[PDB]
Amino acid sequence: EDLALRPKTLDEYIGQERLKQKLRVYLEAAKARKEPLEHLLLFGPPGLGKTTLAHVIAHELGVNLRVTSGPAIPGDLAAILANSLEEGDILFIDEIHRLSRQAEEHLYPAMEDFVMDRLELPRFTLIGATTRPGLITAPLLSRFGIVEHLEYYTPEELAQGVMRDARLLGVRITEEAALEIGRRSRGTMRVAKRLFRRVRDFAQVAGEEVITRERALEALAALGLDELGLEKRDREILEVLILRFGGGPVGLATLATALSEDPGTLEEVHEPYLIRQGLLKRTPRGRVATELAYRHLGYPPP
Amino acid sequence: EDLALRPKTLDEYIGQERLKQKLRVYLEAAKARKEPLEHLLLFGPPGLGKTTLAHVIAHELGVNLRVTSGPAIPGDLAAILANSLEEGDILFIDEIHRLSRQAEEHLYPAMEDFVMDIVIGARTIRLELPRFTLIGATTRPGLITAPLLSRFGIVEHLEYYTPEELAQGVMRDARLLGVRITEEAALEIGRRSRGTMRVAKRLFRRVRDFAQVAGEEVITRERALEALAALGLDELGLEKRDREILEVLILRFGGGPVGLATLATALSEDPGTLEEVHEPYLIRQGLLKRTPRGRVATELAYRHLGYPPP
Amino acid sequence: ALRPKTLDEYIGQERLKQKLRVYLEAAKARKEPLEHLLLFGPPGLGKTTLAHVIAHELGVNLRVTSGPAIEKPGDLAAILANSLEEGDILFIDEIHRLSRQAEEHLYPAMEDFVMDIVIGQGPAARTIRLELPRFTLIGATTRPGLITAPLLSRFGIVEHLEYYTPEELAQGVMRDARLLGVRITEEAALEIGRRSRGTMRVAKRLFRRVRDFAQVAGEEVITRERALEALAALGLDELGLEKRDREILEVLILRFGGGPVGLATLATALSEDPGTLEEVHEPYLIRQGLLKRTPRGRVATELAYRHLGYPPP
Amino acid sequence: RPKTLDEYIGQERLKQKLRVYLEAAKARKEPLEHLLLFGPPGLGKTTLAHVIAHELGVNLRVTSGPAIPGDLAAILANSLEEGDILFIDEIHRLSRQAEEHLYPAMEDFVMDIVIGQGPAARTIRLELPRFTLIGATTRPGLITAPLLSRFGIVEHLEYYTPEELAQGVMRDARLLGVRITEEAALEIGRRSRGTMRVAKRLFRRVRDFAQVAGEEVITRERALEALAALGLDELGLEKRDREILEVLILRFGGGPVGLATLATALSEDPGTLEEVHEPYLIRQGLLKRTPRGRVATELAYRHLGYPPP
Amino acid sequence: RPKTLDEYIGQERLKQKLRVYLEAAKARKEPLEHLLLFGPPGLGKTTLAHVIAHELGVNLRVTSGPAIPGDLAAILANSLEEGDILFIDEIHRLSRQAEEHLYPAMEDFVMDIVIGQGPAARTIRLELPRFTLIGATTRPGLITAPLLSRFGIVEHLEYYTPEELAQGVMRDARLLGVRITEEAALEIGRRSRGTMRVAKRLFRRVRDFAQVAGEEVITRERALEALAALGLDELGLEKRDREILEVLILRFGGGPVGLATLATALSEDPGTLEEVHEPYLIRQGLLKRTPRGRVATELAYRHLGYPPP
DNA sequence: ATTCTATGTGTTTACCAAGCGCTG
DNA sequence: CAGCGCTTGGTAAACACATAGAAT
DNA sequence: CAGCGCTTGGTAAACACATAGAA
Ligand SMILES: Nc1ncnc2c1ncn2[C@@H]1O[C@H](COP(=O)(O)OP(=O)(O)OP(O)(O)=S)[C@@H](O)[C@H]1O
Ligand SMILES: Nc1ncnc2c1ncn2[C@@H]1O[C@H](COP(=O)(O)OP(=O)(O)OP(O)(O)=S)[C@@H](O)[C@H]1O
Ligand SMILES: Nc1ncnc2c1ncn2[C@@H]1O[C@H](COP(=O)(O)OP(=O)(O)OP(O)(O)=S)[C@@H](O)[C@H]1O
Ligand SMILES: Nc1ncnc2c1ncn2[C@@H]1O[C@H](COP(=O)(O)OP(=O)(O)OP(O)(O)=S)[C@@H](O)[C@H]1O
Ligand SMILES: Nc1ncnc2c1ncn2[C@@H]1O[C@H](COP(=O)(O)OP(=O)(O)O)[C@@H](O)[C@H]1O
Ligand SMILES: [Mg+2]
Ligand SMILES: [Mg+2]
Ligand SMILES: [Mg+2]
Ligand SMILES: [Mg+2]
Ligand SMILES: [Mg+2]
């Protein structure tokens, strides 16, 4: 029924250790003096645990959470702040970058002092989660007390997440299988959950009841994933670059035409992970395959 | 009658073996747990069977399917999601990339958790949607935002077809239309296609027109070859313009690096037309190379044109 | 000006006419609408007249529309759902000018003959699939590279218009004179066609100017000499070159010896932006064989030497 | 909420023909013709619409006149199946723009929809399923001739009787769990103005009096003292209407008076006197509207126990 | 909430002349010429406006650019007194309609008022008292030449030194009742970016860390440990800016990169990188913006402990 | 209901630089 | 071996198109 | 004394002017 298995306690939250230290310090300090938290902002690549952390913060402060969104919302944002906002409650605006300039101009004046345009608003904390903080206007971006950045997870944390999701769903999986699924993940929790669900479907169709390590490996091979998590399309991109063009500078148009691919999807979907993993370089004369790409595909380095 | 005859079941779908070997597993697993399929994205070059596969998936699941177009639809998408969604029904959007960047933000909270953020009036309220499936087919996945592209549970790529699969498609279309055709004629039409099902159907229709005008009743191999030669297609599907491009490259410029503007002006052709209409298939077949110093004709071009290698 | 009404009156595109005749006959025999057609080529070759001729041959109606005319998808929906009957032909000139949002509304309209529209304007908005009659779309464009690949793959028949031989331009000029009441001879028409650049509209323009010159000269029949004098007055060589192209060739032959000159050096010598010399003057010179592009520079061919009355190398 | 036509209280004359029309429509497997229901306010035309829809076995689309021009297309194209029923309460309040968009959809079942929106864009004609439309207006005058011309069946809602009002009071008492005798409900219905809302309100007030009195059953007499304490006659006039008649008869001799002088005498707003109290003084034969003023009829003299003029 | 010019923290260069202008205007019993305050955002121009108003002894009317065209007329008519100060924060956001209504009120103290609400109607010229208008903006570019020409005094706000930021931190600590030493406040001010809000926020974070540690006094070592736990460098660069510099220098060799490639390498939004992290990397000499991409200067190499190019 | 203004986004265009061959 | 010429590729800066929020 | 002529007075029904509202 539910596949987005969100943890509810900060102890169930897994991977953001250096963020968790500061968050625990701030939350203990705010609870010690019976004072509401400062305004908080979360940003990072998609799928890393912004909304989950907002809900966990709401639970840990022990108050209610009022969830809204930027696309959902100028004259509207002045209503939720007073109509259904209690003292100490948290207002969570997910995807806050989409919020209008006029709507933003009616939000930060109510952030420094809890009054609008007098009407006394109760003590409240604003939590904003977005992928593009650069779209938030400087006046609104300057009244955020805490600004935090979400980092990529290590394979062990991804394995822990896979095991927890398996236990909640009711699937018997081994430590090594979860480690393999986490290793093949792209440092992202959502990718790990998706890969685990695909392996679960493969095992269920095959009739297996326990996902042993070899069963996980064969399921991932059927999915078409390397030891680095590369799909078939990424491997084909690297192979075309190495063979058809000698691995030297190519360019976006030439490489896209050779691969029967759109240049935009080659540049904004497939390339970033190869660049992160060190299998590709964006030389000013074009794209270049690194020695790691040569050795990963079983080719003699130049 | 109809010219876009689509298969209805996964058995009639012809040549996506690698994709089907996993799609069958996913559908069987979804049916076993009595749960709808996780969200799906189909992408690839035009003419390979994305919309047909979406309809086939809808038929296989047994649930209804609602068709939407990406260019058709920011706040509207909330209305379409809320008004006309039933538990298990598949929602299908073609050209999902054409959705504005503001209109996918509304799809963000309704794909991982099935609850929407809407404002009434009062204040903000949360509308809980039924457990549905969204299928999106697009040729440019790089125009879909990263969060939405991450919300998709299953992402698949449509690859090209072998000549035998194109021949099977031609035979199926012929038996559906009411035209008799030989195995070898269908194989020739498939070989002259550019690995695309739409191209194969179009070539078959042109050959049928030629044979019907000529008065022939059964399209044999010889009649098919005559019709294809009348169209002006080689054994690799090259037209006359492609042969002209290769001949001018080999003869006038010596086959070496030339460039785009020079080669286009030597042809009295627009360079954009040359690079976007004729060049990609020549590159795919191996008859042309985009070297850093210009366009170069490969040895395959020399052998195909019947010219001595340099 | 004057439009032919049948495929026999259409002057001089033989391979296209041979390909098109069988398609038209087959469509007529099967009592079915014709496949979608795309006509592309350089301007002035007769795309719109071919569309009208095809519409007359099929015996159906023709609705003419322009690419920039359709600003919004609502206009396209109104045209497709109301103005068109079963088997009618809708002609869009300069398809590549269509906006991509409106260009992508045509994929279902041409493949499935259904159109997806959102109506309701608020919380009551919902999607409808307007059914469409089995119409036919003919599209004319000069820049096929600006048409999206899914759209270009949906055209059943795609054809290219070629330049006219001087004899065909002479036949067109003679037809225009006969339909206009003039008494031009064959040699004058052939000369007017030769000075043309393989285009019909320029041939008609030149014939009309020669007619004006001859009429004010008092002659009742346009002889070859009168046509030559009128064309020289208009400023055209025996190959149709203007004065600017002629002086470009003169400068290249003299100031640089006719050898590899390069684009920048020649442009500076001629005091021209090398974005006008390359795309307005060079293409026709290369077409006529008067100029050659070399990895070292621009080379004037021997035919340019002979045409300009200069000694051979 | 009644469901079948036999559960409806007291529209016997209308129900007799409604049964025939509905049976004939069902036998042909064809949607019923468009229906218009006239009647004074307070008689329950929406309940009759619901009963008709249930009898036909078809869903509803309820909408009032002043609801939102273009929303008519939305409501017609969103949730209308084959033979669906659309009920437009207060159909004389529709705007002229919204009125000149419905009769195409009544005579031909085709609606023109604005598709481009925004600036002056084009429209498309769209086909709708065959449907029946029920209209309910209390002011037939504001219904234009073209709008009235497209309605196949036109019927009138008449005032109830003391017995049907008594049945309604019994139904309400049974729903609320209050014990009431037949004659008490008959008295309550008699003192109502042939309207269901008035009968229910009177029953609730009598219930309050009886409950305060600590009585477990409401009999005839207890209803009588409750209605006497409410200040009501055997005809339904309050103390204010009796005061109006007595002022008209005694102070002015019953002759023509005029709105301003009578209102000044009664210390009441002239509009309040004209639009709240007078309409039931008329319709009972107790008052007249002469061009020279307001006159009291002989029925007013008889009712108040005064000697005739 | 500072009140007088002596209580203001650190605009020594501006205060030295502002005191003279205020004294000269006060001695003449005449309001001072309209003043325009330039400066980067976050430096506190509204506090200086309040201080100026208090020193002149007149009332202040706070207004912003997008306040509501006719609201300017109201604020100029009703709430202006002889010598009153009208402060318009964010004055380059003022609409052109309100733009071509304020310059007659600055050069002649007369304004036209629309009297016929509704249709076009007519206007009447009205006389205003002699007042001073104080404008504040961060972007001088959007100030048109006619608007800039009518300001008698134009002055610039500049970034504070670490010592002035330390004084502000001490004032905030005293207001909040937290004991902090001289050197700790100096370190907090040094690790800020010449802005008061940054210093206050850093002080609050150090306060949270010290309170969790259960320390009654924030000394120097506690401040240094807290600011190290925040990933702050001696220049105030966070971990993300140092990572940007490291990626630019190591992965790309420091040469031109471009926004898209660098953002892809950092897994960041290009607009986020350009508008939130780059501006302080510049202005410190650690980054350059070439037409061929972004380049790391020698200061970046020296700062990160890397060998020079 | 139309007009106008803004902002955010998709698409195109104009430098600028680097590299390979010829050169004389 | 030191200009001259052509050819590719990427980076930033313009356009042009929409929506939405505005007043009239 | 029984029409004819005038003079007053009140009652209801029209106008005409505003606002507000809505797209
Ligand atoms: N520490 C964690 N433990 C368990 N699950 C986690 C954790 N962090 C993230 N997730 C999972 O990450 C998934 C998606 O991330 P969310 O927390 O829902 O929001 P988000 O990741 O910010 O969204 P996007 O699409 O990446 S912008 C959820 O299904 C969570 O279960
Ligand atoms: N596997 C298949 N079996 C049978 N017919 C097929 C198959 N794949 C494609 N076709 C036919 O090919 C034609 C075009 O295929 P589509 O799926 O409509 O195009 P597409 O894949 O959606 O690409 P576009 O233009 O980007 S939407 C239709 O007539 C289909 O019936
Ligand atoms: N004949 C009836 N039988 C049963 N319940 C009725 C009847 N008439 C009205 N009601 C009740 O009246 C309520 C609905 O209001 P109605 O009085 O039906 O509206 P209406 O008849 O249109 O009155 P007006 O004049 O239009 S406000 C419901 O509780 C019905 O049960
Ligand atoms: N120099 C200063 N001396 C004392 N308090 C100051 C000073 N600068 C700012 N403040 C405090 O800052 C608060 C007012 O906000 P400011 O920071 O002054 O707004 P601002 O000066 O306009 O900065 P920005 O860039 O416009 S957001 C009050 O609490 C003031 O006490
Ligand atoms: N084959 C032909 N026979 C006769 N006239 C022609 C022929 N081709 C072109 N023309 C004439 O030349 C002109 C070309 O313009 P038109 O065909 O309208 O647009 P385009 O510039 O796209 O060709 C027309 O006026 C037409 O009369
Ligand atoms: Mg986002
Ligand atoms: Mg598509
Ligand atoms: Mg054209
Ligand atoms: Mg009513
Ligand atoms: Mg500001």
Residue numbers in the entry:
A (entry chain C): 2 to 74, 77 to 120, 133 to 317
B (entry chain B): 2 to 74, 77 to 124, 129 to 317
C (entry chain A): 5 to 317
D (entry chain L), E (entry chain D): 7 to 74, 77 to 317
Give sentences from the paper:
In bacteria, RuvA, RuvB, and RuvC are involved in processing the HJ. RuvA was shown to assemble into a tetramer for recognizing the HJ core and recruits RuvB. As a motor protein, RuvB can bind the dsDNA part of the HJ and promote the movement of HJ, known as branch migration. RuvB belongs to the AAA+ (ATPase associated with various cellular activities) family, which includes many members involved in numerous physiological processes.
We also incubated RuvB with DNA substrates and 2 mM ATPγS to assemble the RuvB-DNA complex, which was further purified by gel filtration. Data processing in cryoSPARC resulted in two maps with overall resolutions of 2.97 Å and 3.20 Å. These high-resolution maps allowed us to build atomic models of the RuvB-DNA complexes, denoted as RuvB hexamer and RuvB dodecamer models, respectively. The RuvB dodecamer is formed by two RuvB hexamers in a head-to-head manner with approximate dimensions of 158 Å × 127 Å × 127 Å. The RuvB hexamer model resembles RuvB hexamers from the dodecamer with minor differences. Notably, a feature β-hairpin in the NTD of RuvB is invisible in most protomers of RuvB hexamer but is well-defined in all the protomers of RuvB dodecamer. In the RuvB dodecamer, we observed interactions mediated by the feature β-hairpins of RuvB, whereas this feature β-hairpin interacts with the C-terminal domain of RuvA in S. thermophilus RuvB. These interactions, which are absent in our T. thermophilus RuvB hexamer, may stabilize the conformations of the feature β-hairpin in our RuvB dodecamer and in S. thermophilus RuvB. Moreover, the overlaid structures of our RuvB dodecamer and S. thermophilus RuvB showed obvious conformational changes with respect to the feature β-hairpins of equivalent protomers of RuvB. Together, these structural comparisons suggest that the feature β-hairpin of RuvB is conformationally flexible, which may be critical for its unique interaction mode with RuvA in the Holliday junction complex (See section on asymmetric interactions with RuvA). As such, the RuvB dodecamer we obtained is not biologically relevant.
